[PDB]
């Protein structure tokens, strides 16, 4: 089976324009993902990390190719680089880093074995 187009507005212009559900958080459709993604808009508009938007879009609406079965999300390298910058901003506005964006769940690096986006 081939891949689908990205129906979400904020995650259209990225490095890719193709995605496959379900996503890495647990959403089965993109309409539900967008319902939860838009709550990150203050953190994006604030700009703790410049890569935040790409990181969020790589999770909630992950890259996919019809050459490979498994989807392509971000790495631990990206996650830790974003969490370092943005967790202090969340903590000061009364929020903690969510379980859904756990950097331990994602792989360490774009290995020969695994594969993810930096």
């Amino acid at each position: 089976r081939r891949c689908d187009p990205i129906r979400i507005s904020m995650c259209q212009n990225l490095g890719y324009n193709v995605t496959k559900m379900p996503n890495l958080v647990g959403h089965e459709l993109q309409t539900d993902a967008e319902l939860q993604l838009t709550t990150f808009t203050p953190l994006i508009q604030y700009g703790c990390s410049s890569q935040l938007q790409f990181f969020l879009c790589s999770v909630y609406v992950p890259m996919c190719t019809e050459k490979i079965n498994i989807p392509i999300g971000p790495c631990g390298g990206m996650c830790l680089s974003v969490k370092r910058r943005c967790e202090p901003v969340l903590k000061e506005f009364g929020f903690a880093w969510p379980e859904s964006l756990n950097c331990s769940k994602f792989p360490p690096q774009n290995d020969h074995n695994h594969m993810c986006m930096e």
Binding site: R7, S9, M10, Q12, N13, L14, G15, Y16, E28, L29, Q30, T31, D32, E34, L35, Q36, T38, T39, T41, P42, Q45, Y46, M63, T65, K67, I68, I72, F93, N110, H112, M115, C116, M117, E118
Partner: protein, 472 residues
Amino acid sequence: KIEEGKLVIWINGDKGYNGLAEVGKKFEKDTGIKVTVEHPDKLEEKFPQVAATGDGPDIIFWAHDRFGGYAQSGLLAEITPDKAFQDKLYPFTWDAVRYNGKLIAYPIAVEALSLIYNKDLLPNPPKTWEEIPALDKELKAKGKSALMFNLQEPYFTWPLIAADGGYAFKYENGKYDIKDVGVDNAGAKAGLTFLVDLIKNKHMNADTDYSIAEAAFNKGETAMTINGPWAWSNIDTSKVNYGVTVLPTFKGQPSKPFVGVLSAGINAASPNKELAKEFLENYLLTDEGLEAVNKDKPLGAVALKSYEEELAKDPRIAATMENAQKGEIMPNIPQMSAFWYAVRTAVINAASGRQTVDEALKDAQTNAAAMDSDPRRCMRHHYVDSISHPLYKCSSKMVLLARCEGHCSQASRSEPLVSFSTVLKQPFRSSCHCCRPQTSKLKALRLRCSGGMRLTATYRYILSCHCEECNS
């Protein structure tokens, strides 16, 4: 696994599900088509998943705000009620169930905040917000207060803000413009400023919540409050002689509470569209049909004019309908999720005096008001490619790559330079920006090539791109 020649309806447990089965039995008693009403837990979570595969119910019952998301995925079918039937229901309820012009569900009930007041302490309620400060000082002499409600959540504080021309998103032609937010304008500005005045004038506490709001009114410690039909059951228990009326008018204009609309959509995967359509139109939406559901558990206000007029005899339901008609219908778009934290942040900061009124609303306009990114900019594009050496017959592996591409917004040029004797300069002084890597890191890959050696293949993985000069 889909039902053919029978109906199966999903509705939440707190709704009158036994009452809907009464109508389901009447449909079986007439048509010879059995109707199975059922109430699963988290049906709004379930419905997208089951409908996407093809399974699920024929009809689905839920508030209208959620249906916009299902309609976008194409899980609901398009309904076709004639002009005659469209007149049966109120005009504003039809607007709540409309995605990109096409009608996607039948309205049933109408929920909205209403002004609940103490008849003993206050036989005649206030028509205006402006007279409440004056009313409170008179009740403070008697050891009471005028008005108390949940200031934390935006849902309860919004009616005052939206009165003078505030809005979440503009709904101009059966479509919600995401980049058209009205929290920063003078309409919403004046409402919140009046609300903040009440707080620092000691008519109201900034840190009042839903618990203290209800507890105050139930003990007769406050003359008024603001809450939906759901909380009537608690107020009945307190034995406070009470009445529900229209919300007060700020600066002449009416207060606009967010309006929920219990709706009933048909599934696209359902083969029983005709059967489902008649059940909703002919059987359910009648004075007999709605009474059957309302008797089990109350719907409050209803879309059908005929039965609503009968139910409006109870002044509480009539007050809910009047607040609904005047009120703002809640956006069904998923960008509404950002609205809640935005106003809740701005209200609490404006209430505590940590931030001013004008600054808080300007930050809400920035953080939760939709900018798109440009598709032709110099950005970092991603792709997959199988790495293999050209003159070496052996294996290969799938690897992720990243390349730069896009049109730089700077204009390239090349103006001619003047060379004198002993000062022979270049013929031209050019400027030209190319999309290129700003930051990159090394990569490598051992290649298990049988009948030889395992040699490594290196390439640079791009971390970021930027427009830089040609000669650099």
